[PDB]
Amino acid sequence: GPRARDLGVPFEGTPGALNAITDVAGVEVGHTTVISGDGAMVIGKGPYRTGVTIIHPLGKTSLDGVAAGRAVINGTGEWTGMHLVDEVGQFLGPIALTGTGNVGLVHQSMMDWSVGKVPEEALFSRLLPVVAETLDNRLNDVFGHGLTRDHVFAALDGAKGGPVAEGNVGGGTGMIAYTFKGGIGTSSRVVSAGDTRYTVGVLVQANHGDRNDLRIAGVQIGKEIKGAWPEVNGIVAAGPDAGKPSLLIVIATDAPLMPHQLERMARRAALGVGRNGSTAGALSGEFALAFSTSHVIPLGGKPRLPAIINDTDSETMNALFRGVVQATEEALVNQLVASETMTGANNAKVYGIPHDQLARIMKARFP
Amino acid sequence: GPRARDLGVPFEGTPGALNAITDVAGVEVGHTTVISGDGAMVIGKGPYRTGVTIIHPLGKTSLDGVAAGRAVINGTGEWTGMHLVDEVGQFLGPIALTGTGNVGLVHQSMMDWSVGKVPEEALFSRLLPVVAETLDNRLNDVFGHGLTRDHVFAALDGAKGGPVAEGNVGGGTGMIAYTFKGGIGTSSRVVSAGDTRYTVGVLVQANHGDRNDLRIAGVQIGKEIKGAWPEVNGIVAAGPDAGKPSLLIVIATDAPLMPHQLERMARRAALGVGRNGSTAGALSGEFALAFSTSHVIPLGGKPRLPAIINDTDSETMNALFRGVVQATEEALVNQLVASETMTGANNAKVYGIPHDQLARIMKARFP
Amino acid sequence: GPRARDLGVPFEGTPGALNAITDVAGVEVGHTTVISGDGAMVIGKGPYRTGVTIIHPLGKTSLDGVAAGRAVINGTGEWTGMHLVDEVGQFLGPIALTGTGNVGLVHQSMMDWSVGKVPEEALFSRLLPVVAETLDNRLNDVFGHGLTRDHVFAALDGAKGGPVAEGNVGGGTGMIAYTFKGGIGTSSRVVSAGDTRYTVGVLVQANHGDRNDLRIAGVQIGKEIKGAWPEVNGIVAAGPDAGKPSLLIVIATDAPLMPHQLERMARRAALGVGRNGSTAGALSGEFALAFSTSHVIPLGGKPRLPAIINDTDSETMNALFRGVVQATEEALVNQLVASETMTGANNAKVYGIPHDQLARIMKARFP
Amino acid sequence: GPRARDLGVPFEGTPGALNAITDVAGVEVGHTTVISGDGAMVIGKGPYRTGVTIIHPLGKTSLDGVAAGRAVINGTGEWTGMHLVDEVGQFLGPIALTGTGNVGLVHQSMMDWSVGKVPEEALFSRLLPVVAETLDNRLNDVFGHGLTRDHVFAALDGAKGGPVAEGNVGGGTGMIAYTFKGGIGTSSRVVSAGDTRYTVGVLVQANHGDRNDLRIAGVQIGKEIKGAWPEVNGIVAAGPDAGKPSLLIVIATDAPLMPHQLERMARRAALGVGRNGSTAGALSGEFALAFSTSHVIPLGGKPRLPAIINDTDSETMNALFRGVVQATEEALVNQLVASETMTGANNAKVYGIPHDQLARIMKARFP
């Protein structure tokens, strides 16, 4: 399937080989996608359109920590392990991205998974699992216990490097972004800092924004697209014909950055979001987490910092910052393009942004 | 049973009638205490010494929010719903305080409880439950699933006003503080802010500190007490004769404070902690959350702020601040006194601070 | 001359009557602009291209505080009075925006001005002046004491409502933005929340960004413009032909917001900046301060909060948030268009963004 | 003259050789003390009781940065350069501690001093001087321009290693703490972190707290001391018999800590303050700044991090934290003992805590 670039959307900078967070060596991603039932929602019975996405910063077999820092755009949402990140500049274990209703289940399941994987002497380090959410309430039975521990184990165990599936998968399965179908998106940038190159990888779970604000490559596009407004049981549910017939951003880099420097990286995410036109809804939980895969902390050991960067080194830091902004901008658009039309709970129907129209618009704007 | 004052420990200020967080009208507290098994710990088979403590800011039937603000002393621990508090200055639902291994279970159980209590239209407001932890790893099978959804429901439903049980109860059941038995403690102050008297109530779940640092009423008491060091299988496990035969602070007030003013309140907890001598362990998750029961936010309506206070009004603010410092100091000592000797997982034995010795020391120091 | 809209740049939303921060009633703005000398720079002798911009939140005769909250995009710069804003949610006195070299002089001058204007009994409230900077180092003798106490008095005393001068004036006089001439810009939005209208006004002092990242109305315009690169003594200083022949954002609103709510407003500034393409340089001090003119604190008195807004009231908050994003986006373009080509210290020459070319590009893009 | 230990006050831990911040190698301290005039205050004509204290983290000839992090206890005061510290984890140049009315003068004077001392290529790094304040309003003509640029230069140039003068000197000259004479205090700890011993040094400028709250070595001493309350014109101005005849903490360490780790150190200061009984007044600007003298950043070069420490290494981190708490606690008492009775502006008279009574009390409590 085409990604944003394939439909003629231009972006600045140089993407990595996979144009994904896994361009950062050693990062693994797994999805479990839960899609079952149709028709009217009954709490505890579905329909279910949900799941979980796992990111292993250093792979599923690592017991070590990664240096980390976060940023909050708008904090109406949950992301666990973040007080830890704020205090000691690192976290242990995987990142889980999921639906709001799944947070506690995922949190405990990650603990159960550790008991079966980790040496008992190291169990203390698995007590603060990192779990984050956006709300799949239009398409999913949020409270209905559709996600199981087995689902979580499968994502943890199945995670891998290489190409990352985008769209209606894992934590993104039941999401809605810019009044089009939401979900998972990813992008990367290879950046030049003097004689050195670094990779900045971004993955998003997008459930934010309004169609009328959306910009793609600077084009305010919602009004250029015809139709494709959401429907409920046959009736247009938004837009001019209404009535008629949160955002999680994960940044990986192999740059050997210190925790406070990774906070700076995280704070660049908002600028990439800003490029695409949204204004951070009052109830939209929008968060960024950044980590380094080269600045690593062996469990109970000496931190490994292979090289060290000056915060005032504009050449290096700006290269890295611009990388975050650009990869974030593109990951957001890649999400929209990868997500297909879906019908879910209560016959709610949300359209993937139409490929034919997007390509036509891009061709006209960028001949 | 005697509380700290009853053993001759002096404190400054005037406590409320109950000398507890429930001196703040409408606050309800519940505990479920889980104690089963003895001897060698096998993960999933106990022994269990754990539980959960519930605090309903406005009572169990409230759908409304309370103005709130938080502070971090040392952030190596979990407390959910805090991004929400940082962002919008309020939280919905109960505060749960529990052991580290129970966070996910408690988080989902609270959602489940809401489904059976609140109108479907208010379910959105129940998606970010507030759950905090300290670690009962010495006395409890942390990973062993000792806490059940029923335990959580019982605490949610059984919560009430009036006297608050202290010691080895609810979330505090298997905790250890200042190398003595840890647990739950509570105290309050009624403070004169001009011609208006507010109540400041504090509850702690204590699992922090070293005996060598402990100060009670300014007395460095660890070396004055003889014996009572922890044991394993009858062998002293800490202190000089070793070998021979986190902190959660919840502040309630009826002062009509704005969210940023409640952050100031929460930041006062550290001074109260400082009075008692600990230095915040590198891995001690020490947190404070402050809320108002008068500044309330009707769900989906207009915030109710019955009066308004100027931050530069020293008379009012300092009365409130001093209240927090004093009530926190006393709550910590009250905890120690209420907690009794316990033997738990792996035959670990932790002594309650000896009442006879404490009373003897206080009598000598304060005739 | 022309402002951005006059050159055919489209923006979203409805500007206030003045399309300026002074659309918020009672706000006063004053500039002192210092331009003297030409040729090679000698420290302490000029050339000078600097100044100061004063914003009185409630007018120059007010002794009262305004509710306030801030946000940091990248904190490599100075802005005094901000610890106060963080702590007590308000500040007293005017905001001064100036060149880095002028900070201390302006800070003390504001105290001096207070001694002469304020009742003796109220002098305590004047001890924490609000002063912020960006660096005019290419065009100005930064260290050379070009700004005087008299210059500051003149801006304090000459401040007024009505139209605000933009471009090479006040604190913006010697600034550079997006490799074109920087300086002062302003814009406003009147926003609708049901039957209620509010105004959000923004003023920027812009000294940030690179030409190659600049977006105006979503158009990446740096490569579309021919020439107009900076020069030093007749030699192109940047861009392809090189070698051959920080950001301060002030947000005012009449919305009756609490301090933590104004922090949310301030955090929206970054999204507006993001729209225009910059990525926050490592050494670019980018800050936002937001205040309410309706939520005011009589000195030594009871805060006046005429109405109260729920943070979860999306209709109201989103209206205000969108206002910040749009007004920030426009104030940045308004700055560029207002700023004229300038030659300063060491014969550095920076071009105002070319009006003829910009208009042509906008016409071609937006027929 | 005796310090606190010499009067019989016990403290925990091992001080460095000097028991002062200069036990951390390379740190230099300088004071300029300004004392002139008696009787009634007229703004601009004294009497003056003020000054400035300079701390050079790496000595007066250093152009390099030190890694640093800060904490706020209560933010109603000024400390410049802190946005920089928050963002990039270091600051350049000296720390100045002074009276509130002197901030702007000191800020500009430090720039002027740099112009004379620093190479031209390094001037950019001198643009964000670090200046902090407490308010000497009872004893000093705050607005009266008593401090001159020459005073600042003398303290910058006269700074040295070795014993540090305490009491009514430099920035502390006109201060008041716990209703006794305030001033400068300092202490250090050498702390055992495994097989390595680090030094933690602390200097305070104390202008905070109330006599009734003061604890010295856990003894609530205000009521044990007879007389010595402040007077105006021979009449008691505070306390029971009235009418009858802010805090700055600077932490230095040679531990090679990263910036986020120094924030942790700074957050420990509050516990040390807590030990001595104060509750952080609403208008008391109470701040801490911590820097490392081993983790240094050559100007425009590669950061030098000689060794690296794990945040979860309890043995090392707790040793450092305990050092901060104990050194802060002792610095505060050392201040009181060093500070002598002073009469200043408006015939305000503030007593040094009486040495004879203190020694007698300590002897009775600690036989």
Ligand SMILES: NCCc1ccc(S(=O)(=O)F)cc1
């Ligand atoms: N991040 C998920 C969306 C969400 C879910 C709940 C809220 S609350 O303020 O009503 F608790 C806010 C935002």
Ligand SMILES: NCCc1ccc(S(=O)(=O)F)cc1
């Ligand atoms: N045999 C003991 C296994 C075990 C069980 C629990 C832990 S904890 O510190 O993470 F709670 C550590 C080790």
Ligand SMILES: NCCc1ccc(S(=O)(=O)F)cc1
């Ligand atoms: N608050 C519970 C104790 C705790 C549990 C785990 C950690 S971690 O750094 O190893 F993730 C830290 C502190």
Ligand SMILES: NCCc1ccc(S(=O)(=O)F)cc1
């Ligand atoms: N209308 C059916 C009940 C219901 C209502 C709201 C939700 S929520 O996902 O937005 F919290 C879930 C289920």
Ligand SMILES: NCCc1ccc(S(=O)(=O)F)cc1
């Ligand atoms: N905000 C003005 C620009 C500026 C000026 C100086 C610095 S410093 O890191 O060298 F202290 C950083 C940024």
Ligand SMILES: NCCc1ccc(S(=O)(=O)F)cc1
């Ligand atoms: N009546 C004396 C005038 C005066 C002089 C100084 C102050 S201060 O607290 O701001 F330093 C206050 C009042």
Ligand SMILES: NCCc1ccc(S(=O)(=O)F)cc1
């Ligand atoms: N840190 C100095 C004391 C101080 C504290 C507060 C202020 S004010 O801005 O709230 F009036 C002024 C001076």
Ligand SMILES: NCCc1ccc(S(=O)(=O)F)cc1
């Ligand atoms: N290289 C010439 C001297 C000089 C260099 C830099 C500056 S500054 O404004 O960036 F601090 C000022 C003067």
